[PDB]
């Protein structure tokens, strides 16, 4: 195959620095426009920088003076030195090979995440969400789990250790006080709970924490 092996990303505090890289496999950089792109949290695709045969260099205005694109044509490795990192730089970065003549980009590396934040590794608080008084006698009943104040992403949430999969909705995390908050709901037949137990399992790799929260009445 023809591909671009991307380096691992990282977590960095504002003002900090980090270097990304990609190695070519199955081809050579010579003649191509090697570039860096990024997919922001808002889900917008942005061009960041490009370099051609080591003598033509361009930068997105917002990164001039902070980011440096360079290339080793001998080893065929592309680099992106990011300094004076800002919160706005948080995104998924992609290196890519573009045709110099037609100006399109056909070969892309896998996304590499770069998060710029002052937050420290924090385990999440896992709160059980039990039905209000009166909504436990319908055909089905919905229970929930609120995972609040963790950093960094991600967390793994399951219901009944994974055996309960249907009728589940786990929502994308949102930032709250520079920390992440996520929620998940599970809907089961009215006769199931609480005679049968329902438990929210939350794993947060970063903090080596595993929290299981049983959802109980009242």
């Amino acid at each position: 195959e023809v591909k671009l092996v991307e380096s691992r990303g990282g977590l960095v505090k504002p003002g900090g620095s980090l270097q990304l890289s990609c190695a070519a496999s199955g081809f050579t950089f010579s003649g191509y426009a090697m570039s860096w792109f990024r997919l922001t949290p808002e889900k917008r695709l942005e061009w960041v920088a490009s370099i051609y045969n080591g003598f033509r260099i361009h930068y997105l205005d917002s990164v001039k003076g902070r980011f440096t694109i360079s290339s080793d044509y001998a080893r065929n490795i592309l680099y992106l030195q990011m300094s004076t990192l800002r919160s706005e730089d948080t995104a998924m970065y992609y290196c890519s090979r573009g045709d110099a003549y037609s100006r399109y980009f056909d070969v892309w590396g896998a996304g590499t995440t770069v998060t710029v934040s002052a937050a420290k590794t924090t385990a999440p608080s896992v709160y059980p969400l039990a039905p209000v008084c009166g909504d436990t006698t319908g055909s089905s009943v919905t229970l929930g789990c609120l995972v609040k104040g963790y950093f960094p992403e991600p967390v793994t949430l399951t219901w009944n250790s994974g055996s309960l999969s249907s009728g589940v909705h786990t929502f994308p995390a949102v930032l709250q006080s520079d920390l992440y908050t996520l929620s998940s709901s599970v809907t089961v037949t009215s006769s199931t709970w609480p005679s049968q137990s329902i438990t929210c399992n939350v794993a947060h790799p970063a903090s080596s924490t595993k929290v299981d929260k049983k959802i109980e009445p009242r």
């Binding site: 930068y59 037609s102 399109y104 209000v132 929930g144 609120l146 929620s183």
Partner: protein, 220 residues
């Protein structure tokens, strides 16, 4: 600085149907050399972007003949003759005629159509565990609804509340094609104990009136 505008932002279709996505540039993309550097890419969840069409109408190697591109100057169109499941994702147009910088449109999400469905709404009070820490989050789930457009309003003791609300939306469900949303109103324990009536109101096309779920704190 060439601005790229795609229409629509979301395109629901049924498998087998034809689809058309539009892209407009703020300036003509015809280069002085006569070429028009307008391209179309597709990006699926968890994957990197994939080139589909380059220079308006050139299908890239390996791309199915169901994809075709047309247009000129400032207006372009990507067409899919017969939509297949693998085609679902976000389509981006991009220009490289006036560079730097190379620019992209905001993208168009190709999604699946299905019958309308009213949301199943559930409201939850702050947990005793969270209250002990001085916080009070009231949560509302608006599940399995269609179409995706929906509005949520919070009321405390009957009055609209805007501060402290955070929302999250799921992508279209792969099994039933519906959408879901979670809305959380976060207050301090102090504020929560200051009022009694908490209400989550949903406005959706499936109802002329907002769908309402509520509870009173002093009851639990």
């Amino acid at each position: 600085e060439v601005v790229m505008t795609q229409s629509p932002l979301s395109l629901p279709v049924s498998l087998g149907d034809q689809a058309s996505i539009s892209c407009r540039s703020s300036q003509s993309l015809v280069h002085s050399n006569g070429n028009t550097y307008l391209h179309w890419y597709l990006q699926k969840p968890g994957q990197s972007p994939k080139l589909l069409i380059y220079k308006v109408s050139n299908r890239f190697s390996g791309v199915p003949d169901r994809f075709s591109g047309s247009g000129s100057g400032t207006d372009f169109t990507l067409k899919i003759s017969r939509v297949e499941a693998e085609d679902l994702g976000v389509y981006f147009c991009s220009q490289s005629t006036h560079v730097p910088p190379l620019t992209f449109g905001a993208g168009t999400k190709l999604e699946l159509k299905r019958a309308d469905a009213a949301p199943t709404v559930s409201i939850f009070p702050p947990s005793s565990e969270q209250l002990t820490s001085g916080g009070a989050s009231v949560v509302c789930f608006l599940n399995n609804f269609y179409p995706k457009d929906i509005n949520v309003k919070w009321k405390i003791d009957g009055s609209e509340r805007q501060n402290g609300v955070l929302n999250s939306w799921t992508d279209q469900d792969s099994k039933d094609s519906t959408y879901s949303m979670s809305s959380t109103l976060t207050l301090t324990k102090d504020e929560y104990e200051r009022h009694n009536s908490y209400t989550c109101e949903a406005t959706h096309k499936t109802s002329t009136s907002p769908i309402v779920k509520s509870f009173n704190r002093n009851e639990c």
